[PDB]
């Protein structure tokens, strides 16, 4: 009955002073906006239907039209920024926040969904949603003794919407908003549903992407052990944001990095550094690079867990982006490590794959590797073994590459390469 209407038919029904005709026209609009194949969103907007849908949200006397309009507005807000803006300009934000208190679960859920789309557009709309006071009624919906009593889809939508309030930077979410959300976020992080867990980890990863003060807020909540536990999950959609979160945390201070190590995260890295999914392998190596940029006792933890041969393996064979992160892990290792630790790196066979990457057509990684070779030679000077190191580099074709790098297009590349030649060869 309300299937495949024209836009003018929808306008005609909505413009009538008949609430039932309006309900039927609104449902027809919803079904139009629900077809996966190019929904006529711009046509609906140009017809000036948005303010009508928003007004229908306030009709507590007629819950079906509240639901249909909420669904319709949800799908419009799911589109482009201009389409989302059109929904916001219609005054939908405070109207949807009022619907969060609806006695009908499917209606309040739709309001949660719609606010999620609006907040997900960017920092501005995210903060505007917060300013309208969305956080309190959102969190109130999760104020139950046991989350398992809530409908599965209902809980998933709430978690997803909450993660959008944690999303985006420039600027990051308000500090007072993050502090208000965090306790609920921690509780969701201990739930048993994979999708809730995935979105909870994404939310945490968003909050940990920034200044160390932002990281500290999260770490203070004691979520690191749970993040490490989720790091060993079988579900890839859980491991990915959990790894991202852990990776963000170790970009902070040595003390914050230590929390990750103490939680036992390093024991998961043999799997992560050999993970079939390339992006997991890249972010794990990136995480390792920031850990090897820490204290010497933290570098020692990496050694004790037997992660150095895994770094050699990644450097030897991986996607190039992952190998680039491995080069960083090595340069950071050699920069801050003890002579004993640097010697161990060579004994594990770091030289050959390090030299093989000097033939990469990437200026930055060449710089990074040259810094590593430099730092390794410095450790050889303290032991009087620079001659032995020079031979190793000579035996694997490393000297040939360093020599040809003397005539390289970059300034510091040609500088460091020629410096290495005359100093050790």
């Amino acid at each position: 009955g309300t299937v495949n209407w024209s836009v003018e038919d929808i306008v005609k029904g909505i413009n009538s002073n008949n609430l039932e005709s309006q309900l039927q026209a609104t449902q027809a609009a919803r079904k139009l906006l629900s077809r996966e194949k190019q929904p006529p969103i711009d046509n609906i907007i140009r017809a000036g239907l948005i303010p009508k849908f928003v007004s229908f949200l306030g009709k507590t006397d007629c819950s079906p039209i509240q639901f249909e309009s909420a669904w319709a507005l949800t799908n419009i807000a799911s589109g482009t920024s201009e389409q989302t803006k059109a929904v916001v300009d219609g005054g939908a934000i405070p109207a949807f926040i009022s619907l969060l208190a609806s006695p009908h679960a499917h209606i309040s859920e739709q309001a949660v969904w719609a606010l999620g789309n609006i907040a997900g557009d960017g920092s501005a709309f995210r903060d505007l949603v917060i300013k309208h006071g969305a956080i309190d009624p959102l969190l109130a919906l999760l104020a139950v003794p046991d989350l398992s009593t809530l409908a599965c889809g209902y809980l998933r939508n709430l978690t997803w919407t909450l993660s959008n309030l944690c999303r985006n930077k420039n600027p990051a979410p308000p500090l007072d908003a993050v502090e208000q959300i965090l306790p609920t976020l921690v509780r969701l992080l201990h739930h048993n549903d994979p999708e809730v867990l995935a979105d909870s980890c994404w939310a945490i990863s968003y909050l940990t992407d920034g200044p160390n003060e932002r990281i500290e807020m999260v770490v203070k909540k004691g979520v690191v052990p749970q993040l490490v536990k989720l790091l060993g999950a079988t579900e890839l959609p859980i491991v990915t944001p959990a790894l991202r979160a852990i990776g963000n945390i170790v970009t902070g201070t040595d003390e914050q990095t230590q929390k990750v190590i103490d939680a036992g995260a390093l024991a998961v890295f043999p799997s992560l550094l050999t993970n079939p999914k390339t992006n997991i392998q890249k972010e794990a190596t990136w995480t390792m690079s920031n850990i090897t940029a820490g204290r010497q006792d933290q570098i020692q933890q990496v050694v004790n867990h037997g992660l150095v041969p895994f770094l050699v393996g990644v450097l030897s064979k991986a996607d190039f982006k992952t190998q680039k992160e491995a080069a960083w892990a090595i340069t950071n290792y050699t920069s801050g490590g003890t002579v004993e630790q640097i010697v161990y790196l060579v004994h594990c066979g770091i030289i050959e794959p390090l030299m093989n990457l000097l033939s990469a057509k990437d200026t930055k990684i060449i710089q990074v590797i040259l810094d590593a070779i430099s730092n390794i030679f410095q450790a050889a000077e303290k032991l009087g073994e620079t001659e032995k190191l020079s031979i190793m580099i000579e035996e694997c074709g490393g000297l040939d590459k360093i020599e040809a790098l003397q005539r390289h297009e970059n300034e510091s590349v040609y500088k460091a390469s020629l410096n290495l030649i005359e100093k050790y060869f």
């Binding site: 906006l33 589109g79 970009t251």
Partner: peptide, 14 residues
């Protein structure tokens, strides 16, 4: 030497 670093919108389908 530290180096710093779920769809935003979803339509409801039948």
């Amino acid at each position: 030497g530290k180096r710093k670093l779920s769809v935003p919108k979803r339509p409801k389908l039948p």
